[PDB]
């Protein structure tokens, strides 16, 4: 028994250190939103309440309507590394068990959670202000929980509970149970989660690190975003918009829907290439071997259904000796924004690499300028970094970027817009200036032309079924639902999805 | 802490899956190596020998070993290398690399699956066995880091819990390259002095084809990446020989890769026209004032509590030092310099308290495609008041302040570029006279005698001693050298003077 041996233990300065992985602050926010997706949320509202008594002048909230957490899955949040999402297929962004703790501490000193599921509403209050003011060396994470209906406590150790709630009412924006329950009641359904991040990182000037004052319908960099700063890194509304390859969920920043995007739908000629990346034909076999030998490990530890689950993964991975033997590179040219380009690498539906230039994009020029990648990389091909803004296995990752370079050139010469004239193509979509970062002209003809080539896709508000409208309203223009959809078959709420047909290209 | 008994309260805990996640911060594998050798420098190391043996019984066929002669660790400082975040190197007027208490545990696990430490200090011989093969084979969820320690002289166990020691050594002999006490002791005695650190990283992750992740066989004197050599690929990201060479701003350290000294180079004063631009970043006086306002203030807060008293004297000693932080550290030490030995190995070598945190991070004009400031290896000991590293210690945490600092060095990189007036005096002609006769920016400089000697004149030919390790600049052998070959051991440390630069 390995009970007396020393264990690695977190410390206060490790919270700072782990947050330091997030040089990308909207990446830090994006991790908390990823967890909301992994709870199968349909909405994730990201309003920021205005409390000036705290540092930063406000609180950064993440409301959602998903499958939240039970107290066990709440305690699994502070178990660094632990991700219960580990399971067959199951996009489930969380694999590393460290994105929320990584991000909420890059975002501000403190953070308070208000998850909810079934008949439980767990709170997860981790505050570095408490730690600094009381001299904490470890990582003390208050974990109080109440009942979803009665809003009465659900926890074994009452003294622990009292300490947790006392710290919440001592450092949190919410100085009593009444305001904490108000925050809980913001969760409209019987399951969901509200993550607030408070005592926010003050910039060198004194303002918080996140602006909610310049645009009250958005969370932006309080740093003056210098020109080249992309919306996704200067607006978490943009990041949440493009945060997933298949967002079956809506984002309400400041009570205002983000027009979320699959990023495969909203592109010009979204051609999908079934490529074995050269290596992934080898890492299809090793993927079969990985699922086989680890199912053998699953059998060894079992020596039962967990091995059977992993054995069915192995035969499902021997089926992935065809199906995920090749990565789905959904290349497409972003005509809405030319400069917001580069392979949007989705490691199982989470944007890890945004604006990563590969292939002809690495060398300067119009070669593959504009092309968005939208690859749904599984966690078998490759895994992200600690910050989930780079990729861990840099060897296999450079190999995947090289493979996407070959097939990005393939997509480039298959659509052949450069042969027809890349500059003329861009002129056809509003861009008639020299600077590559110049947004498209608001000119009517170019707006219509962009709206046409883009399959005008829009989620619903009840069933969330992505349709292909002849028009656009919204859902910051007016809202929309399937029932008001003017289309003969795609009008019923229960009508089958019309998930985008992808014209597949061929190499060589 | 307890105060109101937070012991009951849920503490955040690390897991085996977090060992992988932590290693994933190191997408950069020689960055993972650099973390261990940084800790060696934090030991005040004279030598760090980095030898890669041949062990076919293990995964990868070899073990990556990190021998040094520094101050090593004691049992307490060893247990501190698994207190994630804990870093006793956190001090004012910092010269160490340690802030984040996580470079060994982040890097040994990126490097390879498992890893075993050995280290020496005073009369202790401590081991930090942390093997992930162990966790994978016996189904361990929590990070379990075996901690055996021996006496440096008697080779006798020194540990409170003897059954714990037995389990630690048993795991070492189960998964480590070294079975039985004798082979572990043989590894210990490689530490030549009475203090040092031998970290071995073994059972490597393997490149997908089955080779180890670190090729030592292509060059038996080096640890190369088990990966090809693209045209665009730095030797520092292709060879830890090169990385450990350029890893420190003040390398009072020789580095012996495969028992062969690396020519560690002060990028402060090993280039053409080094210039010390003392710039306040347009922020640093404010950031230093903010830190002087903060650290002095929080010093009172901790001193108020200890006014218990060790922290109060420490905080008072910090606070007075933080009053001197208002004067001496007001302008960032930007040591700009044009690297003539390798022009393609350029961009600001962003050091940070004597550790290369952001290697090859092009700023300013270098971010813009062209020859503007191409070759200028900017070198700045960014103190721990201005900026702090990232989790991987390959970026910087505060991205706003980092971008502002890079914009500041872009401004003063343009300033340095015009002051030397190298582009004015035909940057193409400059590179032509210093070896490079190709439009290819990667193409290494020509090896003709005239051009090599011409590069030798500009570079002060600097070589480190092997006895007192006093840097010397012998008048104009190349791998072994001592002070009495120039001009003597007792000579004072003569640091190459740098012409100070001023903006506008
Ligand atoms: N806002 C949230 N809504 C719902 N579930 C959440 C939320 N935040 C965290 N969780 C859950 O709590 C756990 C911890 O999240 P996190 O620390 O992000 O680890 P992970 O999501 O498992 N992995 P990663 O996404 O790599 O960090 C997860 O297993 C999620 O299921
Ligand atoms: N080779 C070594 N020589 C001496 N001390 C060491 C060595 N390796 C680790 N240590 C000690 O262990 C501490 C923790 O190491 P580590 O986990 O790398 O964090 P850190 O070195 O404090 N910070 P960083 O490495 O910059 O993230 C060091 O600060 C030293 O006190
Ligand atoms: Mg996640
Ligand atoms: Mg270190
Ligand atoms: Zn509907
Ligand atoms: Zn000497």
Residue numbers in the entry:
A (entry chain A): 5 to 307, 343 to 514, 519 to 551
B (entry chain B): 1 to 307, 309, 343 to 510, 519 to 528, 534 to 551
Which text from the study accompanies this structure?
The Microrchidia (MORC) family of chromatin-remodelling ATPases is pivotal in forming higher-order chromatin structures that suppress transcription. All MORCs share three features: an N-terminal gyrase, heat shock protein 90, histidine kinase and MutL (GHKL) ATPase domain, a central CW-type zinc finger (CW) domain, and a divergent C-terminal domain (CTD) with predicted coiled coils (CCs). MORC2 possesses multiple DNA-binding sites that undergo structural rearrangement upon DNA binding. Importantly, MORC2 mediates chromatin remodelling via ATP hydrolysis-dependent DNA compaction in vitro, regulated by the phosphorylation state of its CTD.
To determine how phosphorylation of MORC2 affects DNA binding, we purified a MORC2 phosphodead (MORC2PD) mutant comprising S725A, S730A, S739A, S743A, S777A and S779A mutations. We determined the structures of MORC2PD and MORC2 ATPase domain with (MORC2PD-DNA, MORC21-603-DNA) and without DNA (MORC2PD, MORC21-603), in presence of AMP-PNP, at overall resolutions of 1.9, 2.5, 2.4 and 3.2 Å, respectively, using cryoEM. The dimerised ATPase domain is well-resolved in all the cryoEM maps, but no density is seen for CTD to model in the full-length MORC2PD, MORC2PD-DNA and MORC2S87A maps. Surprisingly, MORC2PD hydrolysed ATP ~ 2-fold faster than MORC2WT at kcat of 0.11 ± 0.03 µM ADP/min/µM, and addition of DNA did not alter MORC2 ATPase activity. To assess the DNA binding activity of MORC2, we first performed EMSA showing that MORC2PD mutant binds better than MORC2WT. Surprisingly, both the lag time—measured from the point of flow injection to the onset of DNA compaction—and the compaction time—determined by exponential fitting of the cluster intensity increase—were approximately three times shorter for the MORC2PD mutant compared to MORC2WT, indicating that the MORC2PD mutant compacts DNA three times faster than the wild-type. Our data also shows that the phosphodead mutant compacts DNA three times faster than the WT, correlating with its two-fold higher ATP hydrolysis rate and higher DNA binding affinity.
